[PDB]
Amino acid sequence: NKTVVVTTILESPYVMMKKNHEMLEGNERYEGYCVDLAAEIAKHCGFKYKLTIVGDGKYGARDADTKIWNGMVGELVYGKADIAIAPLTITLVREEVIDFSKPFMSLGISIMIKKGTPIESAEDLSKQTEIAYGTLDSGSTKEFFRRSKIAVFDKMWTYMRSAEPSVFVRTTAEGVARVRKSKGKYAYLLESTMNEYIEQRKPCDTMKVGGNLDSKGYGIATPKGSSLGNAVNLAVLKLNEQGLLDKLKNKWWYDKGEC
Template sequence: MDKTLRVAFGVCTTLLLLGKPNWIGAAEDGDSVSRDSGSAGEGGKDYPMFYVTTILEKPYVMAKGAELEGYCIDLLEKLSKMLHFKYKVGIVKDGRYGALSSGGNWSGMIGEIVRKEADLAVAPLTITSVREDVVDFTQPFLYTGIGILLEKDTSLEEASLFHFLTPFSKETWCGILVAYLFSSLCLFLAARMSPCEWDGNEETSFTLMNSLWFGVGAFTLQGTVPQPKSLSVRIISAIWWLFSIVLLTAYIAGFSFVLESGSEQVSIQTFEDLVKQGHLEFGTMESSSTLQYFKNSKNPIQQLVYESMNKKKDTAYVKSYQEAVQRVLDSNYAFIGESISQDLAVAQHCNLIRSPEVIGARGFGIATPKGSPWTNELSVAILKLGESGDLDYLKSKWWESSCSDEDHDKWSPLKPQALGGIFLFLALGLALGMVIAVIELSKKSRHTADQEKKSCCAVFTKELSQRFRPREGTPQESAGKSKP
């Protein structure tokens, strides 16, 4: 009987040892930085203990002496209080996120979860289908994509010959041209109809060419002739002058900003631009989900990105995020990685920039062993933190920019919507001027009709046809005078 009890006790002990996370061994291998939950010893003796693996990466997890801090540590602390568990955090032994080797073994944090060396992996760990086959993931606590991190001096285009057009967008320039032509036409028509600008024997001073030149003179703030006499033409002229002053002010302000801030256009806008250029070497982090994304992609451009990196894998790949940022700062290197981490680098280093294109939308989740009952509880807790605004608070806390007081706000060329008010004001002014010109001609027509005892409409029609009919009398008279 005693022998049977000893055998049973030995079997149970062996099973317990095999099932226990091998955390002590990880600490003995040199992981001196760790963190214990603050709830230990505070009435939580019956709380379950979780062994958490993570990786050092700003601002998710950072070493502060012998302690750890960062976004993921704060998130873990909130989750432990919500779900009532204790935890002990340690750094992953091989310093990797997790990739499947040719031998079928997993490295990094995923490997530690698979081998039961840790209960949770709380880090910027991307949720992928390959990883989901061997571990479970919670709901994402952060969303990101794949972007390109560049150094400003190596990524900005030189100013072009037409850099002076930068303050306004193409649509705005087209709108200004249309407004100029339409205003000149209204000026010409109003001058033709207004009796004050037309005496019947001579051409009005506001011919079509003079009207066009009048509009150009207003743009350059120069005095022009002829001078308007009638109320209708003066209204159209004043509205056009006001429109010109507002546009000049907006143009000068925008062009001054362009010159002072050096806001040239980023030459590498997309991954296609990155592949086509030849002066920048580019790469990503080895054994990362970003590398796997390009490796498995069917997109031709993304396949070219992977092939270009793989040809120079000895120099293209980096081992850590910190190494990647430093290479971008020190050499002609573009880093392809998580856009949200790149945003942090841009916030901390004012001479870095991220290209506009972001591909491969994905999320960061907490990894748990396959079939763990805690996966769903952690997911629900993460959703509650998102609904309460705690996740947004943590992001604003750890992504605070050091360039906010130094850098200018993001600038873009003025679009028609920004100047819509002045365009509307111009249209109303032109319409008012044309209405007054018609009223002026109507008054004269009515006066002439009373004197000649004719219909007002007939006189008005005659006046209009006389003003817009080509005048042939002057050439004929000149020809007649030339005869002996």
């Protein structure tokens, strides 16, 4: 039997380098939620596996000009990996070209504030202009606002699209720094999972407020028609029912949190 090639992505806390990684080999180089999850999936499915970091560092999209899938999705579609174990969002266009398990983690768009900011909901943000707010320039959150027909989110998009200086940031680190350094006058819109992670990072000055604005899930992906997909999906369901997915989330977000 052959070693399963698992594509994954360097993204904290899902996959992170061990400090001594230069003196380590194979799967021992990495730690994180998806490292632990890969070991559990492999245990339940009965395979040996090698974690490999996706070469282009991307989740996966179809290039608008060439029509070629990149990222982990592309690794699956073009025969370079057997399974993707990563926070890969289950979307329509991806589901058409690869197979997904049921989701192992659910999430939604959410609001990050500096502690003390008088905001508790998206509606609160939308009905004022003293506190600026934005999102990742390249993110799925931006696209949610662009396409939304809900009055509150439409108003928020109209504000964000034309706000000056730009309220959009190039990276999560830029967004978080802007929240922390703006003295409560900038709020940041992002995935609840990342928001919750940052809430547990020093110096513990940010928090997540309000309910999620949408709902989506991260799934395990296999090439379309792969015989591995059935067992992997049953594994995700068993791990959820055993409490193990919740245990892993608690471990990497809270037991290992700094706040």
